[PDB]
Amino acid sequence: MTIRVVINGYGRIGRNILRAHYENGKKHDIEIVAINDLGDPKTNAHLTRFDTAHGKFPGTVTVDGDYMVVNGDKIRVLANRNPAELPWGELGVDVVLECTGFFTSKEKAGAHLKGGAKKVIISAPGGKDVDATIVFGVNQNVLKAEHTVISNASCTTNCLAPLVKPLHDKLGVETGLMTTVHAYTNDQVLTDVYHEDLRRARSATMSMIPTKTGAAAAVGLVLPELNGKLDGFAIRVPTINVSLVDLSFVAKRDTTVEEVNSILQAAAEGELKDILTYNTEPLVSIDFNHNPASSNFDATLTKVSGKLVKVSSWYDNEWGFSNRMLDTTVALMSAK
Amino acid sequence: MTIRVVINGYGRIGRNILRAHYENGKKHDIEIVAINDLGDPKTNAHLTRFDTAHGKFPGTVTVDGDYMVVNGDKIRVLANRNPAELPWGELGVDVVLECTGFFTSKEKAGAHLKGGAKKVIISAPGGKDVDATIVFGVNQNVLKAEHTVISNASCTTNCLAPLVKPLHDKLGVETGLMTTVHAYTNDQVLTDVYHEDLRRARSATMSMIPTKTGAAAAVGLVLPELNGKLDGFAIRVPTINVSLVDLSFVAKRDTTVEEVNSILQAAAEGELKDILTYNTEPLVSIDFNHNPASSNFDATLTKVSGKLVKVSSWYDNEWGFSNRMLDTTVALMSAK
Amino acid sequence: MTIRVVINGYGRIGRNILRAHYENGKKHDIEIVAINDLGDPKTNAHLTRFDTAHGKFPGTVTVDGDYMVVNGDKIRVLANRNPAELPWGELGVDVVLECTGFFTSKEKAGAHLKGGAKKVIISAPGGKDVDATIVFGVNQNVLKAEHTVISNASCTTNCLAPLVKPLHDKLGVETGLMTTVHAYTNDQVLTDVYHEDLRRARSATMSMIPTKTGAAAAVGLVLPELNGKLDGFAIRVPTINVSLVDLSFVAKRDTTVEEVNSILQAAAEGELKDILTYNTEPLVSIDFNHNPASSNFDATLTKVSGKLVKVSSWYDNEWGFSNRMLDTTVALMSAK
Amino acid sequence: MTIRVVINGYGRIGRNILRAHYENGKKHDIEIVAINDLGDPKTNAHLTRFDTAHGKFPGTVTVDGDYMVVNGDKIRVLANRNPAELPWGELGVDVVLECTGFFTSKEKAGAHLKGGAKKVIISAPGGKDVDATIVFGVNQNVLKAEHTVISNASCTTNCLAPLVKPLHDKLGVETGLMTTVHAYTNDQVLTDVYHEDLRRARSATMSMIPTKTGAAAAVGLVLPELNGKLDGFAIRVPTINVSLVDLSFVAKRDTTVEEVNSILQAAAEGELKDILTYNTEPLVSIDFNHNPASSNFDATLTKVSGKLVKVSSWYDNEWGFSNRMLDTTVALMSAK
Ligand SMILES: [Mg+2]
Ligand SMILES: [Mg+2]
Ligand SMILES: [Mg+2]
Ligand SMILES: [Mg+2]
Ligand SMILES: [Mg+2]
Ligand SMILES: [Mg+2]
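A: This is the predicted complex of the input protein with magnesium ion.
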């Protein structure tokens, strides 16, 4: 059967989920029947047609009354800050893609359930009470039909976990620390202005700006064997999109650059195909823009010194994650 | 006979006013006795000490109880959204520098007067009910002792008016059109996201972005002879500070590049000294960063074809305006 | 029936000509049989596959011996700084697209003729002795079979001429001055370093940088009725591609914003279709990236104040010009 | 008793050495008596007066005949491609600061000695035949009076060595891998164009760009106990100046964040004072611009998991190195 989906929060994440669905030729048996956003529907349609990072949408978008029509599909448009008031039950909603950032716990995301939706996928790290945290390609097999509110982790965790899973299986990971060299986001600023975080209060276009991230530590939610073994932080730099996971870890046994690369090449050609890619060309970050993979491992950067191993992976922090939201939607509704 | 001033709204404008006052070695007979802002005082002190565009403040800033100490001066720190409740009368406030953007009409800014302040200067274009709109160096002579709420115009108007006045006096301006090539501001965005204006919704770091400007029409408030004679627009480009007025106008008689430049050089050396500067060096925009002048005419860029004249002037859209706020404060208190 | 073309200089202009030829489905009866460049063929093939400004080439590129194979077409790769030594006669070359910038006079470009080529098109303004200067869509009808070395003008002139010709025909242009807000190019620098021009010696990523340009003054070569009537200069700003022509001119009779826009709308739908486009949407510069038109008139920016008229047009300064090089190749070989 | 120095190559490195000498109040007993450069002396003086990254020189620069006058000091200006022909002996030159990049071996740099100079310091990694490689503050004690050609290492090595030496002494470094997040340089490009390295051929303003660095292996030249223990690479990102060393290493034993930070705090307060700094404030990269230290350790970024340690240090990749060139000059002439 066809999964009826709605997108709560038509910001960048929600817009890129919708665009990912149409730009892969709706390969998932999914129908987006509604979007909720406080912005003017004409403005959101315009930002769907044109994007700086991801170019022009290769389709048609029009506004007709209470609907945005995308390639002939009429999508109901809503504007209500309180999700519990949305008519999910009347629309027969199967899955709410919760992309606002304000409803990341199971209790808060349950407002969608109160409105009549069957399930919720949070496009972000969830509270400790969520039923599951999923990196598709790594641990979607843990999903069950009884799960009603899950987290899709973060963009960074979806890049790191496919990288570390095969390495732990074949080599063993004692402990690891990560730096993600990360594009700036809209939580940052153009010129210095008041901000809850004194570093993010500084111009993102002119500086490297450290900031905390739990993505490395969150790999333990997806790979329990690595609980407490990984940590790290991020350095925001002046690029608009595409980021880099830089993981240094102590292997449990002696290895080489070639063996490390061979493990990830086999994973990219096998169990993790189309989720993890294997790259040997001399590419730069923009070459991975609009790439739907979760983790684009760069074998040219691999370094080994003793037991310390350094592996790096490019990821489009918007496009890979938005595509994974669709994969996880299908897996959740297929769970028994 | 020292003017006791307070800053309402310690954003970038309010911070740059305070920094301008202390960096020129408190050259005005002004004492900043209080700041009102809803933000954490420690955060605002940090952003006073460090700025990307304007560098490190060459002084000391500390927070001690209810005061921010700048070079040893205790400045009361307040946080009250209703100006009528502020203790301006108890603090003997002469002038409120209104820098929040929420009290730009005389009706709204009068709340400061109810609180005990004598006068208010709005750091932006004012409503139609303001007693005056002032570009210092051009029309501060219109101020009278009875004026209680005035506008300091905008940064763009403070660059255009000193540029066009001497040319109008000696040549005559029949009509004119201008483009303001302008640095991005915090009203813009890092990557495409909802905005009231569909063009400002687009990444400011990657595109030239057209936007409206009222400077051309607002010059008529400061120079009534030019009412309705000027029009134009602005283009935001990926620079953090410093902007450019590019004015094309039809003169009332034929002229030459040499005469046009000579007129502005005389004004820069005379009546408009320290407000309008005359530049002949091969400079670029960043060379005018942290320049306190309102209008830096670039004689190297002048073009003339018969009556058609093209003149260009660089201006630090933050620092020039901030210094002019201090000049206008003294002029208002000296008005008879 | 097929025009045999070679590209001398496989820098950005030459590469974008080749990419334009293949991305339009090779719609012109043109075969690129050789490219000459001093760079390594593997390097030039890599830069054909991947570009920052224009994305990934939607085709295949490989290196096989002395050939670069593009979508199965074997293209001879040469590396000789002296074009007169190139085997144009042996390869039956009809037209050399001269894109190095070193052979812009008819005498110098004649080196290709000595090598056996029939004709040369310079991808830049030519010396005074070139047989013609062409803005395709405007004056390609002046080409004759006897012309052997021509200029395709510049990207800026190809944007300006389609904009100003309809206006001169219907309104009349007395005189005009223009600014081109222009993306930086590889003649500029990342951080201050020695340069023949002291303004271009300054970081292009941080400043607006004035620079000379002859595009407006040279328009008389393409539209002799406007000889001597136009001039201007450029402001380089921190964008990687796409620029804006900003023309202010005195019309010979009274007009209005609506009449000015109507003139250009008729031209865009008629004589100048697909060369000049007519835009009314609230777009920004990146929206015109990879747009093959010569001149994208922005009707939303038009201003009129008395007899002074301001019209503006976006242009992809690389892609429009590269596509026009192909159009002019066909027109030159079709000339009677 | 005053060391007479000349600068061979007045590019950015030579300019910043001169500016460092004058902007610290000539704190070294050094007089710059000549500079050799093939560029126009007026252009080089202009770029000394104005810089985008480092602002305006706080002094006087004029050109008078064959001399450039800096704060009243007449500096002979020479232009000779053959250093053996330079009048170093006639000028009594003690130390040649070799900053051209063309004389990085002792064999090549000896041409200055043939010209009459006593010693040469290469402002870059040297060939295997150089008498020493110096990171000032770490191993300048290895210098001997008999040394005639030495290397000052690189900016990255001058940041890494002060960071890792105290950690090795007190904690022990078994092995380490580093990433240096590095500002772009003038070896990179604004938009994709030919380069000997296929990654530096890509726009430096739009991408994170991996590149090789010898700093990790070159630390073994200054700290022989660490020979072969460190490896890594660099990521160029879109900032104009200031870079970051991000070192992950396996310690010889389990440790904690507090112990790691304490070791570096003691070093910054002791033997490595003014070379290594200790920072606890929430700063970003631009806050370290124009900072003369070799290594600005950021205690806020430290991470520890068992034996695995991650430490980060900011460094002005231009200004720190330029000041170290002066320190190493004095040490070389004081060596016994
Ligand atoms: Mg079950
Ligand atoms: Mg009261
Ligand atoms: Mg055909
Ligand atoms: Mg031949
Ligand atoms: Mg004929
Ligand atoms: Mg000699």
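Chain A touches chain B through 34 residues (CB under 8 Å). Chain A has two domains: 3-130, 156-317.
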